[PDB]
C-alpha cells in the first residue's frame, strides 16, 4: 500500500 511500486 505505502511501498513504492516496482518498475
Amino acid at each position: 500500500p505505502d511501498t513504492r511500486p516496482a518498475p
Partner: antibody
Amino acid sequence: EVKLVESGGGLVAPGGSLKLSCAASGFTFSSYPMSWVRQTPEKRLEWVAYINNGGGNPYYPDTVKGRFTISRDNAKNTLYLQMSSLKSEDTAIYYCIRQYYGFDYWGQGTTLTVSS
Amino acid sequence: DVLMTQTPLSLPVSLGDQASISCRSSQTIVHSNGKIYLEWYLQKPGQSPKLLIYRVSKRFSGVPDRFSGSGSGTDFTLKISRVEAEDLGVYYCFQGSHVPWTFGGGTKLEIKR
C-alpha cells in the same frame, strides 16, 4: 540493526569492468527488494538499478542499461552490481539500498573512479 | 524523463525558524495506481542520504514531527518547522512514479549563528 556494507570499489580504466558487492545483515535479506544509487562528483544523485526480493524484475535507466547487471545471493546475504564498458560518467560513489517505502536504508558507499 | 527542479539552491535560516524547500517536476507524477511517489532525502555532511518523507507527506520512521511534506500537480514542498543545527545538509526531492526514477538537484540548508 540493519547494516549494509559495500565493497569492491577502486580505479578502472575507460572501457573496463568491475563488480561491486554489498553485505546485508540485521534483517531478513530475502524479504526486501534492493537498489543501487550513485552520487557523482557534482553530488548529483542517480538511480542505477533495482531488483525485487526474489531476484527478478531487474530494471535500469537507459544510461547504464546493457552495461550494468544487478544480482543477488539470498543465501550469502549479498547484493552485486556487475559493471562493464565503463565511461568517465560512471565515476561516482555507489550506494547499496534496502528499499521498501522508499530508499529506506543506505550503505556508506564505495567509490568507483574511471580514469586512465 | 521526469525533470525535478529545486528551489532555492541554498537556504540560510536561524535556529527555531522555519524553512521551505520547493520541488518542481516537468510533468505530473501520478503512478498508474493513482498515488504520487514523491520522496524527500537529507544528506548531512560526510554522510549517506537518509529518507525523511515518502508518498508526498508520510514521515519515515524516526523523523521528528517538524518535517512536513505537501504538494500536487508539479509543485511539492518540504517544511521544517523549528530548525535545529542537526538539520543542516543537502535536501533532495525524488519521484518514484515513472521510470527512470529521478532526483532533484539538491538544496543546501545553512544555519545562521
